[PDB]
C-alpha cells in the first residue's frame, strides 16, 4: 500500500552526477590508456556487468585504481560513463563502433541493443 | 543530440537497493536509538539535505558511524531509508506523524510535502 514519487530515481541520479562533477565521495579511478576517470564504485556496479563482477570480488573490491583492457577507447568510455550518471547516450556516426565495443566489454546490454539497432538502420 | 533510456534511473536505483539488501559496498551505519541501519553515503546524500551537509563536511565525511538525534523514531527512519532506495513511501495513519518529523529532520522536502497534504485531508 505504498505511494510512489515518480521523479525520485531521476533526482537521485542527477544528485549522484553532481557529486561526480564536484569529485565528492568518488572512490575509484578507471584508467583507459593515458586517460583517468573518477567515479563511484556503486554507480559503476549498478550500470555495468563488468564493474559489478570486479567490485563484488573480495580482492578487487578494495582497489582504488582499475585499468581497462588497452583496446578500450577513452572517448567510448567517457560517453558510457556520462550515460551511467545521466541516462543520456551521445551516440554519433563517428563514435558508434567504439561505443558498442566499449558497452559489450562493460556488459551494458541496453546500450549494446541500441547500437546494434542504429548500425542495422544504416 | 543524445538519446535517452527512460528506465535507466529506476534500474540504477533498483541495483543500488539490491547492493544495500546484500550489504555490498555499504560505508556507513546510521544509529537511531538502539537500531542500526547500513547504507551508502552517496545515496543518503542524494536523498537528504541533512546527509548532504554531513558527508560534505571535511571531518564528518570520514565517519563510519552517524548517530541521529534521540527524538528520531527508528521506524520513521526505516520507512524513509526504504523510500530513498525505492521511490516508495509506506505512509500509514499510525506512522505519518513520525515519518513527517523524520523527513523534516532529514530535509527530504518532497516527503514533507506529501505528509502535510495527507494530514490536511484527514
Amino acid at each position: 500500500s505504498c505511494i510512489q514519487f515518480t521523479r525520485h530515481a531521476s533526482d537521485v541520479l542527477l544528485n549522484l552526477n553532481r557529486l561526480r562533477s564536484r569529485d565528492i565521495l568518488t572512490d575509484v579511478v578507471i584508467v583507459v590508456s593515458r586517460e583517468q576517470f573518477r567515479a563511484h564504485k556503486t554507480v559503476l556496479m549498478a550500470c555495468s556487468g563488468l564493474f559489478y563482477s570486479i567490485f563484488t570480488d573480495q580482492l578487487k573490491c578494495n582497489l582504488s585504481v582499475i585499468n581497462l583492457d588497452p583496446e578500450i577507447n577513452p572517448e567510448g568510455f567517457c560517453i558510457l560513463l556520462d550515460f551511467m550518471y545521466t541516462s543520456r547516450l551521445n551516440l554519433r556516426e563517428g563514435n558508434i563502433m567504439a561505443v558498442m565495443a566499449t558497452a559489450m566489454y562493460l556488459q551494458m546490454e541496453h546500450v549494446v541493443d541500441t547500437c546494434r539497432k542504429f548500425i542495422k538502420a544504416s | 543530440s543524445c538519446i535517452q533510456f527512460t528506465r535507466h534511473a529506476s534500474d540504477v536505483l533498483l541495483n543500488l537497493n539490491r547492493l544495500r539488501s546484500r550489504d555490498i559496498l555499504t560505508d556507513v551505519v546510521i544509529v537511531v536509538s538502539r537500531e542500526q541501519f547500513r547504507a551508502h553515503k552517496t545515496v543518503l546524500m542524494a536523498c537528504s539535505g541533512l546527509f548532504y551537509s554531513i558527508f560534505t563536511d571535511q571531518l564528518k565525511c570520514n565517519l563510519s558511524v552517524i548517530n541521529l538525534d534521540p527524538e528520531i523514531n527508528p521506524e520513521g527512519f526505516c520507512i524513509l531509508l526504504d523510500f530513498m532506495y525505492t521511490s516508495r513511501l509506506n505512509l500509514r495513519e499510525g506512522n505519518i506523524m513520525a515519518v513527517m518529523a523524520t523527513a523534516m529532520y532529514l530535509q527530504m522536502e518532497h516527503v514533507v510535502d506529501t505528509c502535510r497534504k495527507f494530514i490536511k485531508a484527514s
Binding site: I3, Q4, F5, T6 | T114
Partner: peptide, 4 residues
C-alpha cells in the same frame, strides 16, 4: 506522487 502516484499509486504504483
Amino acid at each position: 506522487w502516484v499509486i504504483p
